[PDB]
């Protein structure tokens, strides 16, 4: 399994743990359902790992949708990028970085 880039919502989950007052992604809602709003900060993490200025959060969003179909999570503008963890194929799709 290669390992020279930034994971998607996995590495993002780690940041959520170090949210430290949350400054890009956190579980806003006070009830449940994760919440995304500053996907640019994370895409920045890409430019750091990938090192390609040609793109930053473009492939990131495209993946977000491919995730809702991958039963990996979900998205809802009812609260912005409020995303959840679609339950159906998370048998081993929610693992932390190596």
Q: Dihedral of the CA atoms 50, 36, 98, 48 (nearest 10)?
A: 20
The technique is NMR
Phi then psi for residue 25, to 5 deg, are -150, 135
What's the CA gap between 13 and 73, in Å, rounded? 12
CB 56 within 8 A of CB 47: yes
HSE toward the beta carbon, residue 56, CA cutoff 13 A: 11
Nearest Cα residue to 96 out of 28, 2, 9: 9
Q: Which fold has domain 1-98?
A: Arc Repressor Mutant, subunit A (1.10.10)
Q: Locate the domains of the chain by residue range.
A: 1-98
71's CB contacts (< 8 A; 6+ apart) are 86, 87, 88, 89, 90, 93
CB 86 within 8 A of CB 92: no
- What is the residue-wise DSSP string for 27-61? -TTSSSS-EE--HHHHHHHHHHHT--TT-SSHHHH
DSSP classification of residue 77: G
């Amino acid at each position: 399994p290669g390992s020279g880039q930034i994971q998607l919502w996995q590495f993002l989950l780690e940041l959520l743990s170090d949210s430290a007052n949350a400054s890009c992604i956190t579980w806003e809602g006070t009830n449940g359902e994760f919440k995304m709003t500053d996907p640019d900060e994370v895409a920045r993490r890409w430019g750091e790992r990938k090192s390609k200025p040609n793109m930053n959060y473009d492939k990131l969003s495209r993946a977000l949708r491919y995730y809702y179909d991958k039963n990996i999570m979900t998205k809802v503008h009812g609260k912005r990028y409020a995303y959840k963890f679609d339950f159906h194929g998370i048998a081993q799709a929610l693992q932390p970085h190596p």
